[PDB]
Amino acid sequence: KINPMDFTFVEINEAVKLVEMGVATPQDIDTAIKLGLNRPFGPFELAKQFGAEQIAKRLEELAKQFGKKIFEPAKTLKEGKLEELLKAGKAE
Amino acid sequence: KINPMDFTFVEINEAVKLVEMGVATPQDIDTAIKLGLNRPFGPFELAKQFGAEQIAKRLEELAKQFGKKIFEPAKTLKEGKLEELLKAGKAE
């Protein structure tokens, strides 16, 4: 049974993985979302708000439920190294 | 009751609206998704594949179910003007 919140959990790791594959930065993502989507927290601040720990555990659950690639938790998350990752697109 | 497919329906109009608010183009989106997410069709070809008509009708359903902003169908879609929209970020 799915929540509305699961949809931002999945959006988030969509975002995460893009950043993981180097096709975008945490920033252009957050801003375009915030600006385009007119909301207060982009995927990543959202992620920071929530916690890598929580979102993954949850994404796991869904991966079992569905077995689609999209639901499987980004490694950035499943291993909490989120913060060093912002460093990547943010640092240089 | 939600399907796995609903998650790409919502991703799509996430994408759509970004493009609607001018913060990205249909292209940088499709490619970053395809490249970063290593899949065959970006949000928009996906959308083209499916049809503005179908995705909206469906997004509607979810908006009633949840009443979160994220689920409400982009106007680009709910009015099928999808194709002229690719023109925007694609044309100039």
Indicate the length of chain B as a whole number: 92
Q: How far apart are CA B12 and CA B50, in angstroms?
A: 11
Closest partner residue to A7 (CB to CB) among B7, B32, B38 is B7
Angle A14-A49-A56 from CA coordinates, rounded to 5°: 45
Provide the resolution (angstroms).
2.5
Q: Which method was it determined by?
A: X-ray
- Written as one string, the DSSP assignment of chain B is ---SHHHHHHHHHHHHHHHHTTSS-HHHHHHHHHHHTT-SS-HHHHHHHH-HHHHHHHHHHHHHHH--GGGSPPHHHHTTTHHHHHHHHHH-
B 30-59 → A contacts, CB under 8 A: 31-33, 35-39
Tell me the CATH number at B69.
1.10.1040.10
Asked if the Cβ–Cβ distance from A23 to B4 is below 8 Å, we say: no
CA-CA distance, A15 to B65, in Å (whole number)? Answer: 25
- Say how far residue A32 (Cα) sits from the centre of its chain: 15
Cβ of B40: how many Cβ atoms within 10 Å? 7
Smallest CA–CA separation between B35 and chain A, in Å? 7
Cα–Cα distance, B58 to A7 (Å, whole number)? 15
Q: A61: domain range?
A: 1-92
The alpha carbon dihedral of B22, B25, B29, B35 has a sign of negative
Q: Least CB-CB distance to A70: which of B7, B20, B21? A: B7
Give A7's DSSP letter. H
The dihedrals phi and psi of B84, each to the nearest 5 degrees, come to -65, -20
The beta-carbon neighbor of B10 closest among A1, A7, A39 is A7
Residue of B nearest to A64 (CA): B4
Q: Nearest-CA neighbor of B45 among B37, B53, B33?
A: B33
Kindly report the backbone phi and psi dihedral angles of residue B86, in degrees, each rounded to the nearest multiple of 5, phi listed first: -55, -45
Cα–Cα dist B12/B55, whole Å:
9
Closest CA to A76 of A33, A31, A32, A44: A44
Tell me the nearest-neighbour CA distance from B50 into chain A, angstroms.
18
Total domains in chain B come to 1
Residues in chain A: 92
